[PDB]
Amino acid sequence: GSLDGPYAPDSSNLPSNCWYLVNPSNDGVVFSVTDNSTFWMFTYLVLPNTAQTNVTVNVMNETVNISIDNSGSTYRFVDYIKTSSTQAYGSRNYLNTAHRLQAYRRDGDGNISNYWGADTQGDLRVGTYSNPVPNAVINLNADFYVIPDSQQETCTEYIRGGL
């Protein structure tokens, strides 16, 4: 397969209908997005064999706290989400993966899609979140590649088997 890039970390109203495969080297926030009105989302990368740790996250000009706990040898991308600024974030989905690879796509409605699952095999799934942010600034906080949603299958290949 082929991918446009890699491109450096960017914050902008990125084009919809294409997969942004992020390839972080380090843990922490790899992805975030908010319209400042209806939807707040960030993804925190947790290292394998990370004992229970209380960490402080400054993201989207907000500073919050999360508990990370990963007893596996796989990496874990954790999604946190809220629909109002005064609301507390909630963890909805996470992805256990051997590779530092997650991918995000904004559909025609502005909904955010990414890979969910307890593994990158049988439990792997392409999920979609339910609060559309069509014009919101998207923060890809890592080197990323660009794949058309034409080739969701090419993106899936790298998610399962690395790059």
Numbering used by the authors: 63 to 225
What does the paper say about this structure?
For rotaviruses (RVs), which are the major causative agents of life-threatening gastroenteritis in children under the age of 5 years and result in 453,000 deaths worldwide annually, recognition of specific cellular glycans for initial cell attachment is mediated by the distally located VP8* domain of the spike protein VP4. Although structurally conserved with a galectin-like fold, sequence-wise VP8* is the least conserved among RV structural proteins contributing to a phylogeny consisting of 37 [P] genotypes9. Our crystallographic analyses provide the structural basis to explain the unique glycan specificity exhibited by a neonate-specific bovine-human reassortant RV strain and its parental bovine strain, each belonging to the P genotype.
Sequence comparison of human and bovine P VP8*s shows 86% amino-acid identity. However, there are several significant amino acid changes from human to bovine P, including S180A, Y183Q, I158N and F192S. To investigate whether the sequence variations within the VP8*s of the same genotype lead to any structural changes, and how they account for differential glycan binding, we determined the crystal structure of VP8* from a P BRV strain B223 at 2.2 Å resolution. Comparison of the human and bovine P VP8* structures shows that despite the overall structural similarity (RMSD=0.66 Å), the J-K loop in the bovine VP8*, which has several sequence alterations undergoes significant structural change. In the bovine VP8*, this loop with a different set of inter-residue hydrogen bonds projects in an opposite direction compared with that of the human VP8*. The backbone conformational angles in this loop from residues G179 to G184 are also significantly altered. Comparative analysis clearly shows that the amino acid changes S180A, Y183Q, I158N along with the altered conformation of the J-K loop in the bovine VP8* result in the loss of the binding pocket for type I Galβ1,3-GlcNAc motif. The residue Y183 in the human VP8* that is involved in a stabilizing hydrophobic stacking interaction with the type I glycan is replaced by Q183 in the bovine VP8*, which in the structure is shifted 5.3 Å away because of the conformational change in the J-K loop. S180, which interacts with β1,3-linked GlcNAc of LNT through stabilizing hydrophobic and hydrogen-bonding interactions, is replaced by A180, which based on the superposition of the structures clashes with this moiety.
